[PDB]
Design a protein around this ligand. Structure first.
Ligand SMILES: CC(C)n1cnc2cc(C(=O)O)ccc21
Ligand SMILES: CC(C)n1cnc2cc(C(=O)O)ccc21
Ligand code: NA
Length: 116
């Protein structure tokens, strides 16, 4: 549910890290990110108001990097700048009941990864 959608979001994000960061530590990155997102999202997931807390759940990498990304970098031995450098600039990822979607660039459109 929430778990599945976190996975599609995770899969999307680390697809940018593979082949430029060490395979094994990227996996660990994925693993930590999943745990931290669950941990954060716990208590803030309302399937009947999909949009409630969405601004909260939003994973954003502007000129500021979302804390869960920083944390997952630390916990995987990965330089936070190497992680940033390999992900799209101005990335937003919205993980909401029934839909995960993302934007790239401040004037980018919103693209949908998963919806049901
Ligand atoms: C996205 C928003 C329109 N929304 C709010 N509650 C929902 C329940 C379902 C469902 O029955 O699967 C689908 C969409 C829903
Ligand atoms: C005003 C600006 C510097 N700023 C400070 N915290 C922020 C968080 C987000 C976010 O999570 O989307 C976006 C912008 C933020
Ligand atoms: Na390695």
């Amino acid at each position: 549910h929430m778990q599945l959608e976190i996975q599609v979001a995770l899969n999307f994000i680390i697809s940018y890290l593979y082949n430029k960061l060490p395979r094994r530590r990227v996996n660990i990155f994925g693993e930590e990110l999943e745990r931290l997102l669950k941990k954060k999202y716990e208590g803030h997931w309302y399937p009947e108001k999909p949009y409630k807390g969405s601004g909260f759940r939003c994973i954003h990498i502007g000129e500021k990097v979302d804390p869960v990304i920083e944390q997952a970098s630390k916990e995987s031995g990965l330089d936070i700048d190497d992680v940033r450098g390999n992900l799209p600039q101005d990335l937003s990822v919205w993980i909401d009941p029934f839909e995960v979607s993302y934007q790239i660039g401040e004037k980018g459109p919103v693209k949908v990864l998963y919806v049901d």
